[PDB]
């Protein structure tokens, strides 16, 4: 899971 | 939740060209990256369906892959080496932006980018 | 002027729609975003939301003063964040598209 300045999403790792 | 159409590899309105540097990018730079052991996740557009990533194309709006870059070089799509190099950087930066700095896909992309910068430093003069 | 409207109706509007524009559309709330020492380091915060409101209220003396705020917005991201970071790469993508809009700036 990655978070940038208030936006989160699922990465390839997860 | 589908995958968007792949990036274009031809355009009649775009001026085609073929220089000494672009020939080097196809037969030397892209050749060694394509044969690398870590190249397989980057040879095709990101398949967000198979990867179960519904958020990839919600974040990345300008995708790029080696398969697109390779087909663009084969069709004389670019006008100069700078345009092609930017597609490579787009492919790298999209991976660094979407994934965490320690993920395997990032460690694989960083290995390809370092080999990329080694061959670019030996780019011939026009 | 004609350049201050081109920066607002074209430049600021084409950057606002960019894929990586959302971190820069509003001022940085270091308390909410959990960014320690941000205001200790960034002494002149800037964002496209403030630039947009200044172009609409005729705040800038000329176009170069508005461009100074864009550079300030990019430089603040290059100062506070490590090179190669995700947020920096997003800022470099906006600066590149921004510089292309400046090359096509109309004459005074």
Residue numbers in the entry:
A (entry chain E): 1 to 14
B (entry chain A): 42 to 167
C (entry chain C): 60 to 167
Sentences copied from the publication:
Within this class of proteins, the bromodomain and extraterminal domain (BET) family contains four members that are transcriptional coregulators and that recognize acetyllysines (AcKs) using a tandem pair of highly homologous bromodomains (BDs). Despite heavy academic and industry investment in this area, the generation of paralog-selective inhibitors has proved elusive because of the extremely high sequence similarity between the bromodomains of family members (90 to 95% within the acetyllysine-binding pocket residues). Using the highly conserved BET BDs as a model system, we conducted three mRNA display-based RaPID (random nonstandard peptides integrated discovery) screens using a single library (which contains >1012 unique members). Crystal structures of 13 distinct peptide–bromodomain complexes revealed highly diverse structures and binding modes among the cyclic peptide ligands.
To assess the contributions made by each AcK to BD binding, we synthesized peptides in which each of these three residues was mutated in turn to Ala. Mutation of AcK7 reduced the affinity of 3.1B for all three BD1 domains by fourfold to ∼2 to 5 nM, whereas mutation of AcK5 to Ala reduced binding ∼80-fold (KD 29 to 35 nM).
